Amino acid sequence: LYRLFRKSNLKPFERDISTEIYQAGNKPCNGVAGFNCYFPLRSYGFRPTYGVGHQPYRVVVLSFELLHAPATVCGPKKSTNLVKNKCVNFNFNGLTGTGV
């Protein structure tokens, strides 16, 4: 139930859960939003026979809070093959070097 009524827009990282009646006229609405008063969150009303931009789209958009805090999540940074008996520029678990 995508929302269609709110007093204003949404702030960054602001979530709206109350289905408050969007009052626009100074006359009080109150109770059931009927005469010149209406409920929020209009339905999709979707059917399987529409155009292109008339279907649900899932979004997992990232908004990671990269502040001055240390980074917990990082890159997978996969490994390579292990080499023995001959010189390599190993970079084991952070500590670099070169040897056999």
Next chain:
Amino acid sequence: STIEEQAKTFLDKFNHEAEDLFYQSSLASWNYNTNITEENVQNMNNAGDKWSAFLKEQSTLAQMYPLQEIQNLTVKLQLQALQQNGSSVLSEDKSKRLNTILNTMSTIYSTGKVCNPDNPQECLLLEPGLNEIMANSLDYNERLWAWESWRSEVGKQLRPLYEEYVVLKNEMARANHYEDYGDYWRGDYEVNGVDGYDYSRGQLIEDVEHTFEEIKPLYEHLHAYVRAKLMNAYPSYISPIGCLPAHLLGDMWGRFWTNLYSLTVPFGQKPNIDVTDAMVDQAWDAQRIFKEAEKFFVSVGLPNMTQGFWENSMLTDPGNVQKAVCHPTAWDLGKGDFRILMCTKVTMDDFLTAHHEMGHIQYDMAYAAQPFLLRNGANEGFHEAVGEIMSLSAATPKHLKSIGLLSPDFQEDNETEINFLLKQALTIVGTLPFTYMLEKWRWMVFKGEIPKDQWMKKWWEMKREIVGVVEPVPHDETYCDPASLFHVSNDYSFIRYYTRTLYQFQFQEALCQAAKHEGPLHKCDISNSTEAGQKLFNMLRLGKSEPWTLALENVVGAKNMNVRPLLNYFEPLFTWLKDQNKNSFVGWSTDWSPYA
């Protein structure tokens, strides 16, 4: 805390929420038409009535606003597109009883039952098969017999209903601030406030008559020349210098004159360019005719049709084991899912009708940003006009010689182009004077000038003015002469046919301005011309939020009613008719009757 805020709020709701119900109604009627079953009739039993009820409720809650001081003008356009309350505007009892009377007095006409006094086993039905016994009957007297039997069988009960309807329908719209109920559809696209791009309800009637001074050298010449070719089959019943009886036409009253073409060919030794032999090659079907149509639809510049059209509508045969309807209808389903109610087979007329609905779809999708209640054409007669001019562009000889329909080396014949022009003219420009004269008189009658006892006698007198249709014998107040047409029984919107025909070929002319087609006219495609596609792109998107004549005035160059495009379309035909009218007469001596 003002009228503007709540007006915009409830209309922003209404657009989408009522587009949802309109889409529901459209899919219901679609499922019925595609699948005639026991319970698909219910698809209409809950769609149109609920749409009308929702319209009435939204109008009732919308008219509480002044809807005049708001800064936006489109909001008023959809609000003035919402104020069609309909039915009861003055009193519930009278309006509702008249509507219920219509509910049965329209189906009594649509029944099409004829009980001949000679033998009941022969009947005349309103089906197109009647054209084989009235429009294209072999015997000369059989046409007259069919006309008289049809009249005497269907129109006996149609007089009191029509009289009471016309008398009692005025005040309903007169309390609706509309001068007579004809103002409901005469001034549908009448908007005030802004000069230049405005309309006047009384302007139409006064502009009807004076715009045919230059039409007469074309329509009158076409009427006179073809009349000279009616003598070879109607001995002692022609009088080419005068008029012709009403049963000597392709229509019972004078709407269609094309059924006389086979008798009235200019030169019969050469046939018109036909594409049927082309389907001898591989038998283009609907799924293939639609695809090959894109050669002059993709190259225009505008996108394709809807992606959902090619997955829901039938392609080969809707019948199978399923009753279905495939009639020519312009469909706007909404919600970005637009489709065609037609199956295209090996037929030139099917090829034409294939492009009509898809051009309609392109038009509708070109203005997806319009408000839902404003998601139509400029007026009644502009939505279908551009939708059908694409159909009219299918049979284009300069384009037929591109996709194997005709070899691009055969030279155009001496009169085959003129032959096709004359054949097509008798249907479109041979029908415009009908609405020019009879519909104008009908509007004048709606104004109330004709008394209670002049409805039938005066029709014959004023049919001796422009159209020129005469009858062997007049009739007293015991027949159904004037109101006996399928579209005159329920005050159908004839402006959808009037501004259709007046503004017909101006769209094609505007298409061909940047297409560099100056020598040949009346047949020119917009293939391989992006400028032509992008200059009428405004035409296909204007809708109703924009003024009805914004792109029309900016591109075509004729804001008001135009006469030049009609003459220029048939310019070779007009010149040929004006040249080969020797040894004959052009005008009609109306004061003549063969029966007397």
